[PDB]
Paper text:
The eukaryotic pyruvate dehydrogenase complex (PDHc), as the most studied family member, is composed of multiple copies of the E1, E2, E3BP (also known as protein X), and E3 enzymes, which all work in concert to perform the dedicated pyruvate oxidation reaction. Architecturally, the core consists of 60 subunits that form a near-symmetric icosahedral structure, formed by 20 trimeric subunits at each corner. In fungi, the core-forming subunit is exclusively E218, whereas in mammals the core is composed of a mixture of E2 and E3BP in either a 48:1219 or 40:20 E2:E3BP ratio. The E2 active site binds CoA and catalyzes the transacetylase reaction, in which the acetyl group from the N6-lipoyllysine, located in the peripheral LD of E2 and E3BP, is transferred onto the thiol group of CoA.
Residue numbers in the entry:
A (entry chain A), B (entry chain A), C (entry chain A), D (entry chain A): 251 to 459
Amino acid sequence: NPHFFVTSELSVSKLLKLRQALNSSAEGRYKLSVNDFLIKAIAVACKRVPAVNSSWRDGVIRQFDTVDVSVAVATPTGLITPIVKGVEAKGLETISATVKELAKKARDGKLKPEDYQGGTISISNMGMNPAVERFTAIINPPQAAILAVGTTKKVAVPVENEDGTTGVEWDDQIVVTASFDHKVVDGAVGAEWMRELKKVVENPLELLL
Amino acid sequence: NPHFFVTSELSVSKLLKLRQALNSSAEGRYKLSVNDFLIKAIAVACKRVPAVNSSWRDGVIRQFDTVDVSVAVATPTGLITPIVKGVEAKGLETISATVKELAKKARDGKLKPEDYQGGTISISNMGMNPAVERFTAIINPPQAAILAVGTTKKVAVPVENEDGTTGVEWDDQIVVTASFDHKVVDGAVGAEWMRELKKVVENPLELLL
Amino acid sequence: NPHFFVTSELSVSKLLKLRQALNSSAEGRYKLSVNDFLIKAIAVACKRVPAVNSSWRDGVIRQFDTVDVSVAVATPTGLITPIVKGVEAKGLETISATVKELAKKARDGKLKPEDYQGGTISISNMGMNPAVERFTAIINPPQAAILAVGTTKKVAVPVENEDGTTGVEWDDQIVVTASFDHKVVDGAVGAEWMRELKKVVENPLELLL
Amino acid sequence: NPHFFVTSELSVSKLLKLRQALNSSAEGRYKLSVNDFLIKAIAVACKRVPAVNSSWRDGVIRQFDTVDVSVAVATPTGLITPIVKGVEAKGLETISATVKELAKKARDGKLKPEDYQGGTISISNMGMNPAVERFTAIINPPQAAILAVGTTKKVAVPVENEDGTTGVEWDDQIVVTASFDHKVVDGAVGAEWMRELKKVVENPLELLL
C-alpha cells in the first residue's frame, strides 16, 4: 500500500469571521463549527476534480459521480465512521444538524448498520484538543484518499505595510494532511486537488459558488 | 503494519533554564542533558496512561504495569538499543549515569546480551546535529509506540504585551514525532498521551510530581 | 518496506541571488531554475557520502561509484522519470539544457526507452504550484533514497541587530523530505548526508568546490 | 539509652513558593503540605547516607537498604504511627494521598494491624499550632533516629544589599530536632546527615534529583 503523504497550510481567520457572523445571526436552530466549513469545502473540491473520490476493485477501479463523505468520531468502544450523502446538494446547516445528530447517536449507543457502508473520502479531525499538528490514519480499503486536520495555531504571516518595510501582523493557521493510494490517485492530481482546495478555503466567499 | 504518524510541538526554554540551574548547582557527580528530561517525562506520561506501553503477541496483547525505556544510540557497527528499567521509580541523576555509562559501553565494545531484550517504548534523538526536524524509525516488533525527537530551533511565540498590540518575543521550540501500531493503540489514546505529555513538559515543575 | 521519513529546512535567499545574477549575465544560451541548483548540490552531496546512492539485489547490495540522477516529470499519461548521468562531472548549464530538453521530449511524445533504466536517487519537485509543503513518493525498487522538494515560503529568521534586542527580518525558506529504505541506508548516515547537504546549499559558493 | 539531641535551622521560603506554585497548578487531585516536602527530603537524605536508617537487635545491628518512614498522628485514643514504604521510589503526590488517607483512617477508626510494624525513622510534626519550637519524642525501640519538626517563625536573615551596608530583609525559618541512639549512630554521621539534609531542603530544586 504505497500511501504518500502530501500536506498544505491554510489561513482560517476569514473562516472564523464568517463562522462568528453566522453564529451570531443564528436564532438557535443550527450550530456551526470549522469542521462544517471543511467538509463543505472538500465536497465542492471533490466536485471540482472527480479523480480523488474513486474506489479500487479487484483489478478494475470505479469512479463516483456523486460525493459521499465519511466523518470519524471518537467513541470509547473504538473508531466510528458515520456517513453523509449528497453533501454538495445540501447546504451547511443541514449537514451540521446531520453530523451533530450522528455524533449524539454514537454517544447514546450504536447506529443503523448501513451508516458504516459507503463513502468516498474519510475525514478525521482532533482540532478540539491542542498538542497535535499532523496526523494521518490509514486509508480505508474501499476508499482512495484520507484528509486529516490538525489544530489551529497563531503564527506570523507576510504583510507589506508602508510604515514598516517588513511589518509583522499575526494570523491563525491550520495544517492539513492527505494520504492517497498511488494505485488510483497519483501525486499530480493530488497536488492539484489540494491547491484548488486551499484556493476555495482561503477566501470562503466562493463556498456558495 | 498501519503505523500512523502523529506529532506535537514543544516549548523547551523552561527546560533549558532548569537544566542550566541544576548543572550549575552540580558538583560534577552528574551530567544532565535534554534527553534526560524527555525520558523522565515520557516515563511519567506512560505511567499516566498505560495503553501506549503494551505489546502484541500472536493474536492476544499484553499490558505492562511497569515502564521499561529503550534508547537508541548510534554505533559504527549499526543501531544499538540499550534498555533502562524501572525509570519511574528512579530519579534523573541515576538514569543520567546509566545512559551515559551504557553509551560509553557501546563505544568501547559490545554490551551484556540481555540489555537488548525488553522494553516498552523506543526513543531516538539526533538533536545533537542540526538539519533535522522530523523523523520516525519503524516500530520494533515487540513494541507498540516509538517517539522520535528532532532539534531545537528558535521561532516566534504569541505574546500579549501592552505597549505592542501584537508584540513579538522569540523562544526555542522542538518537534516530536510518534509512530504507533494501530493494532493496539488507536489515534484517540495517542493524542491524549501526546497532549498530556506536552502538558507535563511545557512546565517542568510537574516532573517531580 | 521500512521507509523512514527524515526532513530538513533550507534557506534559499542566497540561491535566489545567485540565480538572478547568473540569469541576468546570461545571453540566452541557458536558462536556470532552482531545481538545477538542487540537483547539482545533491550530486555533490552523494559524492561526499556514497552510502545513500546504492541499490539492493536479492540479498546482496551494490554500491555505485558514479552518480546518476533521475528527475520526475508530470505527464498526462502518468509519471515519467528521465535520467541524467555523470552529473558531478558536468556543470549546471549542461544539465539545465539536458533537463529542459528531456522535459520537452516528454511533452511532445515518448522518449528513448533506456532513459527509464538506471539511476541512483529519484528527485521530484512540485515547487511550481503553491499549497504543498511536504510530500514523499514511494522509493523506486532499484533505488535506495528519494528526495522530494516542496515550495518556498517566507518566514522569520533569527537576527541579532543592535538597535532591536530581538529583531525580526524575514527570509525565504524551503522544506525537503527524504525517504530511505532502512535495508541499506540507516538513520545516522541519512542524517549525516542531510546535514552536509544543507551545509552545501545554505551558502552556494561551495557548489563550485 | 544515650539519646543525644542535635538540631538544625532551615529556611523554607523557597519551599513555600514551590508549594504555592504546585498547589495553584493542581486541579484538585492532590493536596500538598510542608510535611510532604520534609518526608520526601528526609527519604532522599536517608538514601544519601544509610547509616541513620538502621535497627539494633540483641547485640547485633541490621542495616536497611530501602527506606520506610513512619509518621506520627494525634488521636484521642493516643499516639498512632502510620507507615509508608518505598518512599524514595514514589513521587510526592502519591505519598500525599497515602498520608492523608491514613490520617482519615485514623480519624474514622482503627487501621490494619501491620501498618504499625516496620519503619526506619519516626517523624512527628505539630507545626500546625503555634507556641512550639523544639521537641523530641523518645526513639521507638526498633528505630535508631527520630526527627521532630516545630513551627515556622519569621526572623531576620543576612543580606548584602548595596544601598544598606548591613541591610535587613526577613524570611520564614523553621527548627528541627534529631534524637539518635548512640549505640548505632554516632554524632559525626548524624551531623553529616543533618547538614546534607539542610543542603537538600534549602533549595528544593534538588528534590527531583
